[PDB]
Amino acid sequence: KAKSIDQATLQLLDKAKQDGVETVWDRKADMKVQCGFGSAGVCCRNCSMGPCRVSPVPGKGVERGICGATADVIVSRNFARMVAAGTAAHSDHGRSIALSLYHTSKDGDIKVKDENKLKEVAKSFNVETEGRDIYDIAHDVAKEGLSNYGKQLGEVTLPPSLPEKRKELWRKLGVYPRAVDREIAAVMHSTHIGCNADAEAMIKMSMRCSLTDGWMGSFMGTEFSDIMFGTPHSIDTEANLGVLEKNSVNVVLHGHEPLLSEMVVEAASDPELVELAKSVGADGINLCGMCCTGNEVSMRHGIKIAGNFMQQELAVVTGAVDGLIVDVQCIMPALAKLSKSYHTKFITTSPKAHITDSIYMEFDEENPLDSAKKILKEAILNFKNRDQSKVMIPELKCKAILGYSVEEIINKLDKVVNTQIGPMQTVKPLADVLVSGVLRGAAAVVGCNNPKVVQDSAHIETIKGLIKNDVIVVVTGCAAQAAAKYGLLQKEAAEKYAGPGLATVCKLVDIPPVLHMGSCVDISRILDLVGRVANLLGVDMSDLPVAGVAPEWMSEKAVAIGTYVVTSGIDTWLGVAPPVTGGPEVVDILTNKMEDWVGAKFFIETDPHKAVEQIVNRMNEKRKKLGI
Amino acid sequence: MNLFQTVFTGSKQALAAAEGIVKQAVDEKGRDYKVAFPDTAYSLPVIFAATGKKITNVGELEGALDIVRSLIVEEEMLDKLLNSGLATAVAAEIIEAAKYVLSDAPYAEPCVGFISDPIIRSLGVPLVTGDIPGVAVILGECPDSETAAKIIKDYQSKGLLTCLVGKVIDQAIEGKVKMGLDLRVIPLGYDVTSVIHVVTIAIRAALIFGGIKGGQLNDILKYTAERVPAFVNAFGPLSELVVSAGAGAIALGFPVLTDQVVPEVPTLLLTQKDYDKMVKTSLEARNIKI
Ligand code: SF4
């Protein structure tokens, strides 16, 4: 099987073979046939009476663990713990953002750059704004956001875009969210030996936990990031490994937390550091981003995107990365080993993510700019250790357009609003094109890479099929970066891949057929958008012809995302089977009974063409239900 | 019934009416009997633009229903909707041709029916010059004669060439609107199919001024969209046939504005209840400068 559809990826894999270094593909091959029990989710290790493995085939072999737990119980608890872990990752990201908001000041390193956005958020949090200092408002907003994480009395605060009907449905179902850390703790408590042994209740607890990610953690992280670093607008950038410069210092930012990458971008324009880069013999400083931190700095500043998850190692294989600065999440620990074969400084900066044999330079949030300058100076000084004979940068990079926040999308939609009719600054043109049938629907393509799928193949095939069927596509994360590398994030792509209705819409609004809405936490934006559409049409989000796809997901964060997208009322297709096939009841809940609960359900489909067909059929049947 | 289904239903009704009237013409006059429009050089302009074929006898008119049949594909995608609008336009043209071959004088005053080529050439000079900054196709009935007269005279005072289809003709007559080719208020006919008589004005504008040869349908549609500043104001309740004819106008690149609740399409299908702002809304939608 081919390892990737990306030519630059293939060239660097040949180079890695020539250099005698191992990749994620090599380790996947070394793992050989993976354990069937773990793959089906019928293995349990929740107590030291175990490990227990029960048969993935009902009626044969061992039926219960030592405590008496069935295959359905073991599967449901394993799934719930994946959701809890994903929720924890996203919530910790949002908590750091809220703490940064709490420390903003007029003369400090972290300021308020979008005051209108802050005032709207303050309105959503019942924070007074009129005749008040902007930083007093910011601190009050940060306090309310922080209380969302750990309040023990009262109800949490949810964005106004969330329909009232969806909230009432959640309350009736018993999944209405509480404080984020409280829900994570509840899931961890109920999976403990001898607690919850009922699959339906376990799945409902996991949905309840995932809601605190989708609508509170990721949402607050995104909106506070907009407040502090600016709301994204349409902006040009370049993507894929070709963005590395042979004659410049190459600094690659990998990870998820945006404050460090924002401070590194600011430090790169420091005159002393630019002079130092010139003095070490480089033309300048070339900042490139990877994964979600790359998505953030690219959405807000046009920083070039070096690559997505399964390309991170190959970035080092070029031999041109002088510094690789990582914060947390989706940072392959093998990088520490791999950087030994090159001059690269692999720099960890977060106390949450220590990696053995990496260079640890703790990013100081109290003095973010000075700390970022010190880290960047280490990367720049490493340019003297470059071995130019080992350098091979593929001449493969692609132009991309991104920055499509909900605000930017609304601004673009204002173009097709007749001034004599109005209203302006709404999602009404999008609702109109969806209701009329010019657009069949909207689909979110999100998720990681996975060695089980030819890298980027499923993302590209799913996106092309959807836009060919007049389904407008919004992309986040590594899927968005796969689209960027391929060339879908271009206005020209409208006439090259889209169907007639979507091509007309793209021409009228002057947008690409695929809209890059940011990082994984920025999936909250997608929720926001859908909610607005629903609130404009007076229906629940489960009545709309919308869907989400995770063609190549790998992370626990992806599991939590799919769970809260389904719980919000949006059908979700998974291109990688989750470890639930061992529990028939869990499969039936996720793919059949969920529709009775929240009006949406999971679809497991490993063939992208079949997934596109199923998405189109499901959207059409929801349209016929809605009468459009 | 959604927009696509409404357009498909309208196109099927137009096809049924065309089949009935063609059967009547075949029964009364014979398949060798001549089929023509008064003083034109492009036979039936819509069929000539779509295929390049000139319809000369009744048998060929009966064979032209296959064009309407092949232009109706009931799949909910935008291209099929535009093709279905074009099917309605072809069916309306066939109905008008059958009217002309059945009756010696199908239209009486003030209705003018078909517009001859010399009138098109006369209007071409003020069209490109800018003395005619647009073509207002008014179809249906306004709630009052006063509002219809007000809108029509507002268009007239701005130099636009306004064409009238339906009961709006009677409302304008009650409103003391002075009509004629020099007064730029042209009543086409009381039936919806009479709207084709302004559609052929645009089509022949591509045939005469644009120089596009017959059968180059995409070139004709591009020319009408980028050169002919026409728009539709549909007043009063809209049947499926009216919506299908509006889909044809959209296929020609002409935006359709109405006072009725319809599934809106930005820049193409717009609802404007306020009759005091309909003229400005149409001028903005068609990008017309006075
Ligand atoms: S919780 Fe039950 S099934 Fe799991 S390891 Fe312990 S005894 Fe075995």
Coordinates of C-alpha atoms in Angstrom, one line a residue, chain A residues 416-421 428-429 432-433 436-438 440 468-470 500-501 504 508 627-628, chain B residues 1-4 76-79 257 263-268 270-272 277 280-281 284-285:
Chain A
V416 CA -24.9 39.0 -2.2
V417 CA -27.4 40.9 -0.1
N418 CA -29.6 43.4 -1.9
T419 CA -29.2 46.7 -0.1
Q420 CA -32.8 47.6 -0.6
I421 CA -33.9 44.3 1.1
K428 CA -29.3 34.7 5.9
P429 CA -27.8 34.4 2.4
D432 CA -31.3 31.0 1.5
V433 CA -29.0 29.0 -0.7
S436 CA -33.6 26.9 -2.1
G437 CA -31.6 23.8 -2.9
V438 CA -28.9 25.6 -4.9
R440 CA -27.6 20.6 -1.1
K468 CA -18.9 17.8 -6.7
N469 CA -22.3 17.1 -5.2
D470 CA -22.9 20.8 -4.4
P500 CA -22.9 23.7 -10.7
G501 CA -24.7 25.1 -7.7
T504 CA -22.3 29.5 -8.9
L508 CA -21.2 35.0 -6.5
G627 CA -39.8 20.3 3.1
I628 CA -36.9 22.0 1.2
Chain B
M1 CA -43.2 21.7 -2.7
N2 CA -39.7 23.1 -2.8
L3 CA -38.2 25.4 -5.5
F4 CA -36.9 22.6 -7.8
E76 CA -32.4 18.6 -7.8
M77 CA -29.3 20.3 -9.1
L78 CA -29.0 23.9 -10.3
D79 CA -28.1 23.0 -13.9
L257 CA -38.1 40.0 -8.1
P263 CA -37.4 30.3 -1.7
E264 CA -35.0 33.1 -2.3
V265 CA -31.7 32.8 -4.2
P266 CA -29.2 35.6 -3.7
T267 CA -28.9 37.9 -6.7
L268 CA -31.3 35.7 -8.7
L270 CA -35.6 38.0 -4.5
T271 CA -38.7 38.9 -2.4
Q272 CA -39.5 42.6 -2.0
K277 CA -38.8 50.2 -3.0
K280 CA -34.7 50.6 -6.6
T281 CA -34.4 47.0 -5.6
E284 CA -29.7 47.3 -7.7
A285 CA -30.3 43.7 -8.5

